């Protein structure tokens, strides 16, 4: 690995500089190098890893959607034949996106998840695993699609089981996991009623626990609750 010669602390430092410069590909490469040092990640380091890859894959997903829409219009009746270029370029972007997802999943499997014993780290990584299988599922069209969807579901479900046992209903990791699992149900699993039920239950249980929080924790939790509310407004 090209980061093998750089100190762990220097990789972390540079990941933070890359974030400030909005150089998210660099950020992700620095954080991959830090993970590959083999030590567990702190809370702040886990969130650097997540931010970096979320931004990289977010740009790829947005580009893939643009190209997929153009390709679908090319296959309408009355559309002029333009050759293989749209499909080829959509496939190029798709393959890169799949490569980034495989990279993240590989870091989680070797060996972030197996070393994560505290609920806050284990739930975080299992949520990531569900997310990156979900991004694979967004572009999947073949004979492994059902298994990719089930891999996302299984990771989210394990994270949910731990989070419900070990975290309060207002914990931001628990809330963000429930938010993303509800999106999985709505957008991937063709289960809009499950998505709505999960979002509503998550919101209501967090509401009832806000009274226990400091002002700063209240701000953290209500920000994610608003995303659940935004989705419920979209979906109902």
């Amino acid at each position: 690995g090209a980061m093998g010669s750089m100190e762990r602390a220097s990789l972390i430092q540079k990941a933070k500089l890359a974030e400030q410069a909005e150089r998210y590909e660099d950020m992700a490469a620095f954080m991959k190098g830090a993970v590959e040092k083999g030590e567990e990640l702190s809370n702040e380091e886990r969130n650097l890893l997540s931010v970096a890859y979320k931004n990289v894959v977010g740009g790829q997903r947005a580009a893939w959607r643009v190209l997929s829409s153009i390709e679908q219009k090319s296959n309408e009746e009355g559309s002029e034949e333009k050759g293989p270029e749209v499909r080829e370029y959509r496939e190029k972007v798709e393959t890169e996106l799949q490569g980034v997802c495989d990279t993240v999943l590989g870091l989680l499997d070797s060996h972030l998840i197996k070393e994560a014993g505290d609920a806050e780290s284990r739930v975080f990584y299992l949520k990531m695993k569900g997310d990156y299988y979900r991004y694979l599922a967004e572009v999947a069209t073949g004979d492994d699609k059902k298994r990719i969807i089930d891999s996302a579901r299984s990771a989210y479900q394990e994270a949910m089981d731990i989070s419900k046992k070990e975290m309060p209903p207002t914990n931001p990791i628990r809330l963000g996991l429930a938010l993303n699992f509800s999106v999985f149900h709505y957008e991937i699993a063709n289960s809009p009623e499950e998505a709505i039920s999960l979002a509503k239950t998550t919101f209501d249980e967090a509401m009832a626990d806000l009274h226990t929080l400091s002002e700063d924790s209240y701000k953290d939790s209500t920000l994610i609750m608003q995303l659940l509310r935004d989705n419920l407004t979209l979906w109902t």
């Binding site: 963000g176 938010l179 993303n180 509800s182 999106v183 995303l227 935004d230 979209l234």
Partner: peptide, 6 residues
Amino acid sequence: KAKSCT
């Protein structure tokens, strides 16, 4: 697109 965690 529904909002996922930011």
